[PDB]
Amino acid sequence: HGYVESPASRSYLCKQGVNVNCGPIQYEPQSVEGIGGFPQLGPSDGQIAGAGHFPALDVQTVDRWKKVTLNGGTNTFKWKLTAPHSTKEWKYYITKKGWNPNKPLTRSDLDLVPFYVKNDGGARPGTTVTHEANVPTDRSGYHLILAVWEIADTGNAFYQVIDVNLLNN
Numbered sequence: 001h002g003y004v005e006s007p008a009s010r011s012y013l014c015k016q017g018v019n020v021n022c023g024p025i026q027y028e029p030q031s032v033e034g035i036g037g038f039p040q041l042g043p044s045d046g047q048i049a050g051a052g053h054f055p056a057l058d059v060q061t062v063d064r065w066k067k068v069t070l071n072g073g074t075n076t077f078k079w080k081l082t083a084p085h086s087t088k089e090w091k092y093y094i095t096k097k098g099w100n101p102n103k104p105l106t107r108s109d110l111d112l113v114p115f116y117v118k119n120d121g122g123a124r125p126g127t128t129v130t131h132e133a134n135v136p137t138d139r140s141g142y143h144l145i146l147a148v149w150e151i152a153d154t155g156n157a158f159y160q161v162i163d164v165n166l167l168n169n
């Protein structure tokens with residue numbers, strides 16, 4: 001179990017009371033677990049944000065969620081893991097340039113080639129995991145970053161949607 005501490009994920013901000021009406025997940029941002037093998041397998045379209053559970057996170061409009069402001073280019077991504085697991089890989093996806101923010105998240109709305117991916121070869125991590133990734137510099141405004149944590153032993157993965165206000169000038 002775990003969540004993206006920085007930049008603050010949607011479930012994390014629910015916990016901090018920044019987002020509202022998030023359901024039970026507000027008390028466990030670390031627990032957005034669903035089937036792994038994304039994007040080939042995993043939670044169904046329109047159910048990515050909640051990973052098949054916690055449907056409240058799957059609601060998608062322009063004003064529904066509070067946005068984290070980020071620059072394109074190099075960014076530090078810090079997870080917090082409440083339980084470390086043998087790790088297949090870490091992946092970070094971003095919405096396409098002309099994606100529909102008033103529509104539930106679907107694989108078709110994502111650049112299915114992650115802008116950052118790290119393989120851990122089954123290794124077990126610490127309670128703090130840090131990644132330096134290059135956020136695409138060709139997008140602007142409201143976008144979603146989908147952070148995925150693939151667990152090696154269980155065919156499961158943890159899905160962390162981040163609502164971002166992107167800046168690329």
Ligand SMILES: [Cu+2]
Pocket residue numbers: 001002083085
């Ligand atoms: Cu866990």
